[PDB]
Amino acid sequence: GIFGAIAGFIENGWEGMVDGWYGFRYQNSEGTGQAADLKSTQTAIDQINEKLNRVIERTNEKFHQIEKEFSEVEGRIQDLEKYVEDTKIDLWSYNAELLVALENQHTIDLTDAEMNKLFEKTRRQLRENAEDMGGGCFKIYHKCDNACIGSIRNGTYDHYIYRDEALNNRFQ
Amino acid sequence: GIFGAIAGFIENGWEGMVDGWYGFRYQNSEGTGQAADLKSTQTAIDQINEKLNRVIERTNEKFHQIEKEFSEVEGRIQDLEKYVEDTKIDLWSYNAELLVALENQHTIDLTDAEMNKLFEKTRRQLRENAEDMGGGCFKIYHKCDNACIGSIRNGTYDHYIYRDEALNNRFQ
Amino acid sequence: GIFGAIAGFIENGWEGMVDGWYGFRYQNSEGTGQAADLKSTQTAIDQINEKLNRVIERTNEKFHQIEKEFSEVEGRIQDLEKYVEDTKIDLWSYNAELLVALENQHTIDLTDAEMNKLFEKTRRQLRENAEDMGGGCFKIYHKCDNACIGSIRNGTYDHYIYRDEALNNRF
Amino acid sequence: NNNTATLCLGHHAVANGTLVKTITDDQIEVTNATELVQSISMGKICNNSYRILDGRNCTLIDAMLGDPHCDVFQYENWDLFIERSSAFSNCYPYDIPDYASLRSIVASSGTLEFTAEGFTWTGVTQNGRSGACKRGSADSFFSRLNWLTKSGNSYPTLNVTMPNNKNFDKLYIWGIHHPSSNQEQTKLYIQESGRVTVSTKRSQQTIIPNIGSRPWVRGQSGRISIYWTIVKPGDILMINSNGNLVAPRGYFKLKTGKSSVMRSDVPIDICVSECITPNGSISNEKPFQNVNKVTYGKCPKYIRQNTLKLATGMRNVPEK
Amino acid sequence: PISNNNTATLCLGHHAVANGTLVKTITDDQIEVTNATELVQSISMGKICNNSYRILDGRNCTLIDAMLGDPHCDVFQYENWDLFIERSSAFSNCYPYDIPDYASLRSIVASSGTLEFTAEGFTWTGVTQNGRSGACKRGSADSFFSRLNWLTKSGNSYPTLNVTMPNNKNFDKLYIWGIHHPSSNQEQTKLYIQESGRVTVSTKRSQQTIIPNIGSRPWVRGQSGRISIYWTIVKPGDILMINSNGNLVAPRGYFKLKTGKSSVMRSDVPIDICVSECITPNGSISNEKPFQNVNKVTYGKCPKYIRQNTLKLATGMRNVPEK
Amino acid sequence: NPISNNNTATLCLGHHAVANGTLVKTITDDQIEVTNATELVQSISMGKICNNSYRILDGRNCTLIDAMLGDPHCDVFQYENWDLFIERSSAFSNCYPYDIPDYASLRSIVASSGTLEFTAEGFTWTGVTQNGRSGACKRGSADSFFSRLNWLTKSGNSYPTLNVTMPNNKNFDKLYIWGIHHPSSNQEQTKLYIQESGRVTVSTKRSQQTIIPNIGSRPWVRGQSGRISIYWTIVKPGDILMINSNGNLVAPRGYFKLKTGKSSVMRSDVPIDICVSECITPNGSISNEKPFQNVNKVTYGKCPKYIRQNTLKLATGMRNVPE
Ligand SMILES: *[C@@H]1O[C@H](CO[C@@H]2O[C@@H](C)[C@@H](O)[C@@H](O)[C@@H]2O)[C@@H](O[C@@H]2O[C@H](CO)[C@@H](O[C@@H]3O[C@H](CO[C@H]4O[C@H](CO)[C@@H](O)[C@H](O)[C@@H]4O)[C@@H](O)[C@H](O[C@H]4O[C@H](CO)[C@@H](O)[C@H](O)[C@@H]4O)[C@@H]3O)[C@H](O)[C@H]2NC(C)=O)[C@H](O)[C@H]1NC(C)=O
Ligand SMILES: *[C@@H]1O[C@H](CO)[C@@H](O[C@@H]2O[C@H](CO)[C@@H](O[C@@H]3O[C@H](CO[C@H]4O[C@H](CO)[C@@H](O)[C@H](O)[C@@H]4O)[C@@H](O)[C@H](O[C@H]4O[C@H](CO)[C@@H](O)[C@H](O)[C@@H]4O)[C@@H]3O)[C@H](O)[C@H]2NC(C)=O)[C@H](O)[C@H]1NC(C)=O
Ligand SMILES: *[C@@H]1O[C@H](CO)[C@@H](O[C@@H]2O[C@H](CO)[C@@H](O[C@@H]3O[C@H](CO[C@H]4O[C@H](CO)[C@@H](O)[C@H](O)[C@@H]4O)[C@@H](O)[C@H](O[C@H]4O[C@H](CO)[C@@H](O)[C@H](O)[C@@H]4O)[C@@H]3O)[C@H](O)[C@H]2NC(C)=O)[C@H](O)[C@H]1NC(C)=O
Ligand SMILES: *[C@@H]1O[C@H](CO)[C@@H](O[C@@H]2O[C@H](CO)[C@@H](O[C@@H]3O[C@H](CO[C@H]4O[C@H](CO)[C@@H](O)[C@H](O)[C@@H]4O)[C@@H](O)[C@H](O[C@H]4O[C@H](CO)[C@@H](O)[C@H](O)[C@@H]4O)[C@@H]3O)[C@H](O)[C@H]2NC(C)=O)[C@H](O)[C@H]1NC(C)=O
Ligand SMILES: *[C@@H]1O[C@H](CO[C@@H]2O[C@@H](C)[C@@H](O)[C@@H](O)[C@@H]2O)[C@@H](O[C@@H]2O[C@H](CO)[C@@H](O[C@@H]3O[C@H](CO)[C@@H](O)[C@H](O)[C@@H]3O)[C@H](O)[C@H]2NC(C)=O)[C@H](O)[C@H]1NC(C)=O
Ligand SMILES: *[C@@H]1O[C@H](CO)[C@@H](O[C@@H]2O[C@H](CO)[C@@H](O[C@@H]3O[C@H](CO)[C@@H](O)[C@H](O)[C@@H]3O)[C@H](O)[C@H]2NC(C)=O)[C@H](O)[C@H]1NC(C)=O
Ligand SMILES: *[C@@H]1O[C@H](CO)[C@@H](O[C@@H]2O[C@H](CO)[C@@H](O)[C@H](O)[C@H]2NC(C)=O)[C@H](O)[C@H]1NC(C)=O
Ligand SMILES: *[C@@H]1O[C@H](COC2O[C@@H](C)[C@@H](O)[C@@H](O)[C@@H]2O)[C@@H](O)[C@H](O)[C@H]1NC(C)=O
Ligand SMILES: *[C@@H]1O[C@H](CO[C@H]2O[C@H](C)[C@@H](O)[C@@H](O)[C@@H]2O)[C@@H](O)[C@H](O)[C@H]1NC(C)=O
Ligand SMILES: *[C@@H]1O[C@H](CO)[C@@H](O)[C@H](O)[C@H]1NC(C)=O
Ligand SMILES: *[C@@H]1O[C@H](CO)[C@@H](O)[C@H](O)[C@H]1NC(C)=O
Ligand SMILES: *[C@@H]1O[C@H](CO)[C@@H](O)[C@H](O)[C@H]1NC(C)=O
Ligand SMILES: *[C@@H]1O[C@H](CO)[C@@H](O)[C@H](O)[C@H]1NC(C)=O
Ligand SMILES: *[C@@H]1O[C@H](CO)[C@@H](O)[C@H](O)[C@H]1NC(C)=O
Ligand SMILES: *[C@@H]1O[C@H](CO)[C@@H](O)[C@H](O)[C@H]1NC(C)=O
């Protein structure tokens, strides 16, 4: 993916994450833990369902048309009738091929996007209290009980509380 | 967007910003201010006009074609005339539907990029004299009058002269 | 491109990099040097190869078709035979124009992406031992012989080993 | 360590992913995908969405004409007429110039509503019959056609009129008889050669007969050629003939129709499906199908690929 | 609470508008952007503009009656068009006729774009020319199609006509001719002597024989008989030949054929002085946008007909209001 | 500090570039330089047709139709077959003048079949002279006729109602070619067939075609004011041909076998030559390495799709940004 998150700087997925497409694994003084991030999951799901809404149960009424099989040999007219259908199919086949390749290319991209967005949403939250260790993991340089992880998860973490403790374990 | 800047880590647009599409708001010892960034605004606008030039006033000459309304019932030759037309229209409709949905998806993604790119351009300029607050805002840890803001905006900010000051204000 | 690396914060290309698409230049105690990054070069070439393979020698057999030039005026049937061909040609010409413009966009943007991904992978390895100077260059705040540079390039650079030394030189 | 924590971000994966095609990748594994190509029929033609008519051993034309074994179809109407391949004609041998166009016009209109009309055929014997066209175990003829012959030693010029005072197009099916010998031409029709001129204000079709032997079919070395004439509101039908006329008995009603005709040999049955093909009905959940290019109703589009997997999840990168 | 003088705050951002507009993308069915632009043209001018392409109003005449020389269509002699307009009020007022493959002839002429007709001295030896009929009133007398010559007997006979006309030009000539079908046997022998006519029209490569067909047809403007019109196209270097011994409605000359960009359209909207390069039956339309929903039948520089009536292309970023 | 420090280093990241880039078109730009690109439109034929991949047949001075009928100068084409038959524009007929209703369809059927494999049959012609000949159709030093047609004429002073039959016991569709002769005058008609007017009726169980002659002058072609008209009948496995004439029949000598081929015909004047290509046009063979082509809409083989554009460069590299 163009953002290098999935199949990239995050090494693999978690089969263990049953309840979300994206989420957290963490370790602190209380043990370790795992939580799903619902908002990113929903953005990626809604996006895919919208592609889906645009193709499934979206067929079109067509009634009497032209004949496409022929028991007799006729020549000029039948040549035309056959060429018309041949041409049509080739053009829809082309279309369908392209549609799926593009949509899939795009589904891979926007799911890489949501991974990246979350990783940035979390980094921006941690300010100077944390470093990117690589692998999609942050080393948080301060005591962080689960309720604190909870505050990071639910977007309420306040870096000014731990900034002094953090800058001090980080440097110097 | 895929970058998560517009309708993402930036809360919202500025209705008060009428002289440009992207830009800066700022606050210092001299007060509050707002100036647009012309280079990005031009980039977004150039890309959109290039789409637009591709489709407005670019139509094909066609002259004598086939009959498409019929007053009499004929069967086989009429069936084929109607079928060919129906086939043509269904296929042009598909192209149109798909083209607009692509262009739009692109337009949204590339204006997000220009926004994110302006952010990144400014982060590099500022080096270790500033910190991403979140919200698309930087906290700059040194005396930064309008002349100094001006510098960032026209790409002439030299981080080196403020560095000693700035390191000091943020890690002490 | 959308990542702003190529034709952006990377000011220009290197005509001297003759064995890679992406890579590194460095200057240290031991001197100056250039090395390609293969993983990044290959990813980019592979993806372009798949675009290419999807459109070359994929032509489809066609045999007896309808007639497309005429030496007599005939009216209705010829009108229809000609309309079907002009209709068919216009549609493929559009397919062709759109296919090339989309791919080309995507190729520009995916080559931009690998340049950024190389940059980010590098940033992440160096942790606190280096600052981004702009231009795609890092200032590495410690002694860094050719062996050490290689360690960065083969993804094995360990930053704790030099952290104290570098934190010193930055503050 | 008690004064540091670790927070890792990630995404899910599955034991069993599925391969899809993208622009840059021929194959690549995602957590989930969905099939956009319908390649499986139901085996049968479903009859509960649209009104389907099993033609059995009758073609749509033979039903229209009134072949005796096609009588159960008098006045039938359909959304889709299904022609079986084992269909056969079992009446007097005939040929129809531009057969496909009539079949199409009948298929299209969707009905065999026939209204008889009070034709006066002064000075001829009507309801001519034949061993080729048994009904009961009695010689007979196409039920919608009136085969006229001499009365005594005359077949006077027939000049009849019939106006369309309706607000729909009338369709008339008539014919000309081509006899096998001059010995027969004269015996049946008196005159040495027929003429049949079916005309309106706008159109006219003369047909001359053509005596001579054709291949033997159900006792007959002769033939009947079938023609049709449409009559629009306000217009008027005129028939002029001094021999060989296989006359009309009435008109068929022509409707702007959604109807059609299909050739299949699969069993009709009770299910529900709004897409019909010669292989049977197919589901229409998916946008495309690879079952048959011949379709009727709400149908996925025919294409040459049998599989197209659309990714409905992220890229799958398993663990260990 | 008071910004330290050795700090400053710098925020980046983008604009937004009051009047956002909804557009469709890949990921979103509807989404608000700062600006859009309609790419589907669903509105016509309700008239046809004459100032670009040469438009010709057929009025009461069809192109075919204009070509044959129906009396009330005399004003259309030598005319030419980029676009011939046929009205639904258009009627015929001559001898009743039919045209096998009418459609094709109409196309062929409409395509050529002209009724430039040149008379040729055909020599009809042993026959009376310029047959006329009360069914075809010119002014206040019996007349006929001006571009056709109805031949009949002279005295006791109608000899076997055998006339030839070489095409020494460098353009394809079109000859319109016909055959009269009498109402009765008496009318046949009265007019032509031979009890059944024959018309063989030939070139070095083609030929067409039509035998007449006698019998009553519906009364139309006095007539129970009919005329059937056929055409023939003689190519440069070739040579027309006509061999009849009854029932021939003769040609008086040829029509110049031209490969050209001209046509014919059925509409009943008025024609007016304006400018437009695209015409439909609903009227002229603007060709600024690339697609249109007004009509499938078009002529000139036209947007492509599609089924959708609106497609908004975004001309601006995602709109995100304050508050 | 001019001399760099021993205790720092500089690591710069970049991409390559070339002195000589090339321009391509994108969504955001009409033109933008990339390190390289591949042209996707073939607009250069080889200037000749290649005869090694597909079986090509030079028709030389002959049409496919003449070759089928057995026009003397086309006798080399007997029992031939082809993937692609090439017709030259300088090809002429040199035998009795004829015309073929729906010539186009017969040409297309035969081309499609891909063979002039003719098998003769025992048509017992009772009571007539066979193998008629004409000064219009020299074979060697002598008057003759199409090799596949038996021109029948009277025996003494009688031409009886011929009634011959011929079943199809094979498992393929037989194609029978036949005709009727149109004389110039009644004098000739009776000289040749006794009956003042003839008639031909060819029939199967399911189909029939009756043709009547039309005596009269046509334009003089190679010594003739008369014409032959060619018709065909296709007979299905199980069916049965029946021929019934009392005058003017130009009889079939047998049948042509029809195949479900991948065969065709193509008009072209370029020379045929040794080389290997699987895509052919009137301009010559083209390479099919590329997906599209601008050479011709007439093609045969494994062909790139005809488009209107002459170049479409596809980017095979990143954006080029020189040093
Ligand atoms: C995810 O797992 C899928 C599960 O498959 C299995 O079922 C589970 C419970 C375990 O038992 C596991 O061990 C099994 O393998 C797996 O699905 C499958 O993927 C393979 C391709 O890797 C499919 O192979 C193709 O099979 C068809 C025939 O399929 C029918 O018959 C077999 C009889 O054994 C049954 O599987 C079904 O009844 C099928 O209806 C072959 O004709 C086809 O051959 C073509 O392709 C190969 C190369 O790919 C060529 O060699 C051949 O010449 C042909 O051109 C394939 O071999 C397999 O059918 C399919 N299984 C099922 C049950 O659907 C899937 O691969 C896993 N996904 C990933 C991403 O790993
Ligand atoms: C892999 O990706 C596929 C995408 O194709 C996912 O499959 C879809 O899953 C969702 C949710 O499970 C399905 O949504 C449901 O649609 C029902 C309507 O029927 C559809 O699906 C059937 C297939 O059996 C078709 O026959 C039919 O034409 C329709 O397309 C709705 O009825 C459901 O609504 C409600 O139903 C019940 C009762 O009210 C509630 O309990 C539900 O919560 C729900 O509100 C429902 O919306 C969708 O139809 C599936 N598509 C297909 C093609 O099967 C898979 O989920 C995904 N797999 C994994 C493992 O993630
Ligand atoms: C074969 O069969 C057809 C049908 O039976 C015959 O055709 C009819 O021919 C008669 C005349 O022979 C036609 O009658 C003419 O109608 C004209 C007006 O028609 C309209 O208006 C009247 C109102 O009165 C309506 O009734 C009619 O339906 C039409 O809507 C009149 O103008 C004609 O009158 C003539 O005679 C007298 C003077 O002698 C005067 O009234 C006039 O001056 C005029 O000269 C006449 O009445 C009739 O329309 C035809 N019918 C059809 C359906 O075409 C064939 O004659 C017949 N032929 C043979 C050989 O058998
Ligand atoms: C219906 O009307 C047509 C046209 O009037 C008649 O057809 C013409 O019939 C004549 C009589 O046979 C044809 O004459 C022959 O035509 C050939 C024409 O080709 C060349 O010759 C001319 C004349 O010298 C050159 O000027 C010109 O460049 C041509 O290239 C000639 O080849 C014939 O030449 C000679 O034939 C013999 C000797 O071999 C002798 O009679 C003379 O020496 C003669 O010159 C000959 O002239 C003429 O071609 C026909 N024209 C057309 C268009 O077909 C029909 O016969 C007529 N039918 C009836 C029933 O009257
Ligand atoms: C914080 O900053 C404010 C804002 O003023 C300015 O920003 C600073 C970084 C300085 O570089 C200023 O030069 C710049 O304009 C300071 O308020 C301002 O202080 C200056 C210095 O005393 C005042 O200028 C003087 O004003 C007096 C009395 O009017 C005159 O006698 C002098 O001639 C001269 O003009 C200025 O008036 C004053 N402005 C206001 C609104 O109070 C502020 O002192 C500073 N405070 C701290 C603690 O850093
Ligand atoms: C012209 O020639 C054909 C072929 O010789 C003749 O057709 C044949 O006519 C005979 C005479 O009645 C037919 O006899 C019938 O044969 C069938 C065979 O199944 C049989 O079931 C009947 O009881 C009857 O005997 C024969 O079928 C028929 N064959 C064909 C192909 O038509 C024709 O009669 C000749 N015409 C003239 C005027 O001589
Ligand atoms: C750059 O691209 C061109 C073509 O897209 C490559 O050169 C062509 O190679 C192919 C066969 O490999 C043929 O079209 C011609 O033989 C070559 N083109 C010309 C103009 O001679 C070229 O090798 C690519 N790579 C580079 C230059 O590094
Ligand atoms: C990776 O690099 C380490 C740094 O030393 C060197 O760099 C590479 C590119 C070679 O050129 C060496 O000869 C240099 O000394 C190595 O010490 C280390 O072994 C390497 N490890 C792996 C797994 O490649
Ligand atoms: C955000 O989290 C804060 C603290 O983290 C906790 O969150 C979950 C829900 C609890 O069950 C405990 O694990 C922690 O106390 C909360 O104080 C705060 O109220 C939360 N706010 C919102 C809007 O979710
Ligand atoms: C940038 O802006 C400063 C202050 O606003 C101004 O003095 C100067 O002209 C600009 N400098 C350059 C190098 O463009
Ligand atoms: C469906 O039936 C057709 C015959 O109409 C057959 O050729 C085809 O292979 C079948 N295809 C299916 C079931 O996909
Ligand atoms: C927005 O688009 C409109 C309509 O497409 C166009 O006329 C105008 O130039 C644009 N106006 C603004 C304010 O962006
Ligand atoms: C058409 O004909 C009628 C009656 O002859 C006449 O009054 C009218 O003016 C004509 N209409 C036009 C548009 O010329
Ligand atoms: C729009 O075009 C259609 C088709 O020709 C027509 O039926 C409709 O009335 C038109 N609208 C007008 C003339 O206002
Ligand atoms: C190729 O041949 C065609 C004949 O079909 C001719 O009209 C055209 O001018 C030629 N075009 C080329 C060589 O591109």
Strand pairing class (E83-86; E55-57) = parallel
Signed CA dihedral, D287, D290, D293, D297: sign only = negative
Angle, CA E45 vertex, CA E289 and CA E275 arms, to 5°? 75
- Assess contact for D246 and D147: CB atoms under 8 A: yes
Separation CA E224–CA E218 (nearest Å) = 6
Cα–Cα dist E215/E230, whole Å: 20
Residue D44 alpha carbon to ligand 11 centre in Å = 13
The crossing angle, in degrees rounded to 10, of helices B76-126 and A76-126 is 20
Q: Domain D51-266: which topology? A: Hemagglutinin (Ha1 Chain); Chain: A; domain 1 (3.90.209)
Q: Which of C117, C147, C127 is nearest to C10 (CA)?
A: C117
Tally Cβ neighbours within 10 Å of residue A89.
Answer: 15
Strands B137-140 and E8-14: antiparallel
Question: Closest residue (by CA) to atom 2 of ligand 9?
Answer: A151
> Judging by DSSP bridges, how do beta strands E83-86 and E263-266 pair with one another?
parallel
Residue type for position A61? E
How far is Cα F309 from Cα E98, in angstroms, rounded to an integer? 45
3-state DSSP call for residue E11? strand
The answer to whether the CB atoms of A64 and D6 lie below 8 A apart is no
Classify each residue of A5-35 as buried b or exposed e, where b means 16 or more C-beta atoms within 10 Å of its C-beta: bbbbbbebbbeebeebbbbbbbbbeeeeebb
List all chains that touch chain D, counting a touch as 3 or more CB pairs closer than 8 Å.
A, B, C, E, F
Instruction: For chain B, say whether D105 makes contact (Cβ under 8 Å).
Output: yes
User: Coil, strand or helix: which one is A91?
Assistant: helix
The residues, any chain, with a CB within 8 Å of residue F304's CB and separated by 6 or more, are C59, F42, F279, F286, F288, F290, F291, F292, F293
CB atoms within 10 A of CB E129: 13
Say which DSSP state A5 is in.
I
Answer for the pair D52, D24: CB distance below 8 angstroms, yes or no.
no
Q: What's phi and psi for F19, nearest 5 deg? A: -60, -40
- Contacts of residue A52, defined as CB under 8 A and 6 or more positions apart, other chains included, come to D34, D310, D312
* Residue of D9, D20, D24 to mutate, interface with C, max C Cβ within 10 Å: D24
Cα distances (angstroms) measured from residue E252 to each of D132, E129, E144, E167, F216? 54, 11, 12, 14, 22
Left, alpha or beta for D305 (phi > 0: left; psi -120 to 50: alpha)? Answer: beta
State both tokens at A31. Answer: 């043990």
Contacts of E233 in chain C (CB under 8 A): 72-73
Q: Are D106 and D64 in contact (CB under 8 A)?
A: yes
In angstroms, rounded to a whole number, what is the distance separating the alpha carbons of residues F71 and F96? 9
Measured CA to CA, the distance from residue C141 to residue C28 in angstroms comes to 11
H helix or E strand, kind and range, residue D139: strand D138-140
Spatial separation of the C-alpha atoms in residues B101 and E28, rounded to whole Å: 9
Q: How many CB atoms lie within 10 A of CB F40?
A: 24
CA–CA separation, C14 and C23 (whole Å): 9
| Strand, coil or helix: D54 | strand
- The rounded distance, in Å, linking the Cα atoms of F26 and C103 is 8
Return all residues near B170 (Cβ < 8 A) that are at least 6 apart: A128, B131, B141
DSSP F15-50: EB--SS-EEE--SS-S-EEES-EEE-EE----SSEE
Q: Rounded to whole angstroms, what are the CA distances from C55 to C50, D20, E127, F35, F113?
A: 9, 18, 71, 20, 32
Q: Say whether E104 sits in a helix, a strand or coil.
A: helix
Query: How near does any CA of chain E get to the CA of D56, in Å?
Result: 37
β-pairing verdict for F313-315 and F37-39: antiparallel
If you compute the radius of gyration of chain C from its CA atoms, what whole number of angstroms results? 27
**For residue C151, how far is its CA from the centre of ligand 8 (angstroms)?**
6
Output phi, psi for B14, to 5 deg: -110, 110
- The answer to whether F274 faces chain B, any CB pair under 8 Å, is no
Q: Does residue E281's CB lie within 6 angstroms of at least one atom of ligand 14? A: yes
Cross-chain CB nearest to D214 (options F161, F199, F208): F208
The answer to whether residues C167 and A168 touch, using CB atoms and an 8 Å cutoff, is no
Q: Which residues of C touch F280 (CB under 8 A)?
A: none
The arrangement of secondary structure in E54-269, i.e. its CATH architecture, is: Alpha-Beta Complex (3.90)
- Give CA F54 to chain center in angstroms: 15
* CA nearest to C99, candidates A90, F312, B97, A51: F312
Instruction: Count how many residues are written for chain A.
Output: 172
User: Cα angle vertex F65, ends F64, F66, to 5°?
Assistant: 95
What proportions of chain E, in percent to the nearest 5, are helix, strand and coil? 10, 40, 50
Give dist(CA B124, CA B143) in Å, integer. 19
Q: How far apart are CA E132 and CA E138, in angstroms?
A: 10
Beta-carbon count within 10 A of D2 CB: 8
Q: Where are the alpha helices (DSSP H) in F101-222?
A: 103-113, 186-193
| Whether the Cβ atoms of residue C89 and residue F308 lie closer than 8 Å to each other | yes
> What is the Cα–Cα distance from A125 to A119, expressed in whole angstroms?
10
- Rounded Cα gap, residues F232 and F106, in angstroms: 8
Short-list F251, F248, F237, CA closest to F204: F237
Q: Which residues on adjacent β-strands are paired with residue D158?
A: D241
CA F231 vs CA A99, E108, E136, E224: distances in Å: 49, 27, 40, 35
Interface membership of E265 toward B (CB under 8 Å): no
A152: containing domain: 1-172
Closest listed ligand to the CA of A145: 9
Q: Please tell me the distance from the alpha carbon of residue C158 to that of residue C144, in angstroms, as a whole number.
A: 12
Q: How many domains are contained in chain A? A: 1
The order of strands in the sheet holding D204-207 is D158-163, D236-243, D195-199, D204-207
Which residue, among F293, B87, B88, has the nearest Cα to C60 in the 3D structure?
F293
Which residues is D12 bridged to in the sheet? Answer: A14
Question: Distance of alpha carbon B39 from its chain centroid, rounded?
Answer: 12
Which residues does chain E have within 8 Å of residue C75's beta carbon, measured at their own beta carbons? 101, 103-108
C-alpha closest to that of C67 among C51, C58, C54, C78: C78
Instruction: Report d(CA D186, CA D175) in Å as an integer.
Output: 18
Q: Which residues pair with E234 in a beta bridge?
A: E173
Which helix (H) or strand (E) segment holds residue A110: the answer is helix A76-126
Tokens representing residue A42 in the block: 């929903």
> How far is E127 from E242, CA to CA, in rounded Å?
14
For residue F2, give Cα distances in angstroms to C16, C146, F5.
Answer: 24, 21, 9
Mutational test site, ligand 6, from D181, D185, D221, D223, max ligand atoms within 8 Å of CB: D221
A137-140 and B22-28: which strand pairing?
unpaired
Whether the Cβ atoms of residue F180 and residue F213 lie closer than 8 Å to each other? yes
Q: In angstroms, rounded to a whole number, what is the distance separating the alpha carbons of residues A141 and A152?
A: 14
Write the CB contacts of D187 (distance below 8 Å, at least 6 apart in sequence).
Answer: none
Q: DSSP string covering F233-294, please?
A: EEE-TT-EEEEEEEE-EEEE-EEEEP---S-EEEE--SPEES---SEEETTEE---SSSEES
Instruction: Specify the residue for token string 């258009």.
Output: E90
- CB count in 10 Å sphere of residue A3: 24
CB atoms near residue D75 (< 10 Å): 8
* Ligand 14 contact via E295 beta carbon (within 6 Å): yes
Please give the structure tokens belonging to residue F79.
Answer: 């029992």
Record the tokens describing residue A65, joined without a space: 């048309």
At A65, which CATH number? 3.90.20.10
F105 in Cβ contact with A74 (< 8 Å):
yes
Residue F123, helix vs strand vs coil: coil
Resolution rounded to one decimal, in angstroms: 2.9
Ligand closest to the CA atom of residue E202: 4
Determine contact, residues E58/E66, Cβ cutoff 8 Å: yes
Tell me the C-alpha distance between E322 and F15, whole Å: 41
d(CA D75, CA F76): 60
Residue in chain B closest to F30 (alpha carbons) equals: B50
- DSSP conformation letters of B44-82: HHHHHHHHHHHHTT-PEEE-S----S-SS---HHHHHHH
Shortest distance between the Cα of A92 and any Cα of chain E, in A, equals 16
Q: Is the dihedral of CA F45, F48, F52, F55 positive or negative?
A: positive
Contacting residues of B for D101, CB less than 8 Å apart: 74-77
Lookup: tokens for D295: 């379709």
Q: Which two tokens stand for residue A12?
A: 């693999």
β-strand partners of F178 = F231
Pick the CATH number of F55-270 from 3.40.50.10320, 3.40.50.300, 3.30.70.980, 3.90.209.20: 3.90.209.20
Alpha helices in chain C (DSSP H): 38-55, 76-126, 146-153, 160-170
Instruction: State whether residue E181 is helix, strand or coil.
Output: strand
Q: Which residues contact F85 (CB under 8 A, 6 or more apart)?
A: F56, F57, F59, F64, F111, F263, F264, F265, F266
Candidates B73, B86, B171, B172, partner chain A, best to mutate (most A CBs within 10 A): B171
Cα separation, B5 vs A121, whole angstroms = 11
Residue F242 CA to ligand 6 centre (angstroms): 11
Using DSSP's 3-state secondary structure scheme, residue F74 falls into helix
In angstroms, the CA F152 to CA E239 distance is 30
Alpha-carbon dihedral E249, E254, E255, E257, rounded to 10 degrees: 120
Size of interface E-F (CB pairs under 8 A): 31
Burial-class residue D183 by CB neighbours within 10 Å (0-12, 13-18, 19+).
Answer: exposed
